[PDB]
Design a protein around this ligand. Sequence first.
Ligand SMILES: CC(C)[C@@H](Nc1ncnc2[nH]ccc12)C(F)F
Length: 166
Amino acid sequence: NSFSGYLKLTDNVYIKNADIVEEAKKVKPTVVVNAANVYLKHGGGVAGALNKATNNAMQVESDDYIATNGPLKVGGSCVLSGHNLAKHCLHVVGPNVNKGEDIQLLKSAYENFNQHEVLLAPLLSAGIFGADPIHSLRVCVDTVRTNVYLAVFDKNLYDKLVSSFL
Ligand SMILES: CC(C)[C@@H](Nc1ncnc2[nH]ccc12)C(F)F
């Protein structure tokens, strides 16, 4: 958990302009959060990048989890191995608002972070899931009560988030 170069936005939310994969390799946190889908198929966005950095070990493990437990619910999560990136990976499913899933479930998705004291995480539902990234940061700030270090890999978006937050 040796986080460097973060900006503190609130008592418990920190933000950095970095690829979450590079942060995980440098820090080796206790928990890295994945922005997953209900079948844990890590095909693109943050999920594809984290799985690629484990050389598909995350996908093989996720397929075994689904074989034994079935899919997650939207707003739900599971804890799996973090492989070479972290001790654990918290896979969290935010709503895919572009497919009519209710944005109210973004609060349920961020509530899963509260089971862990410290996490390295991305913005949920802000990739191909279509939610406004500044709205996603507002829900994170209003819902997460443990210590969360957010990595955002787009400088243009990082600057808009810091300006809107202060
Ligand atoms: C979730 C998105 C709003 C965000 N993407 C990411 N944020 C942090 N590390 C990442 N690695 C690969 C993708 C990626 C933005 F930068 F595009």
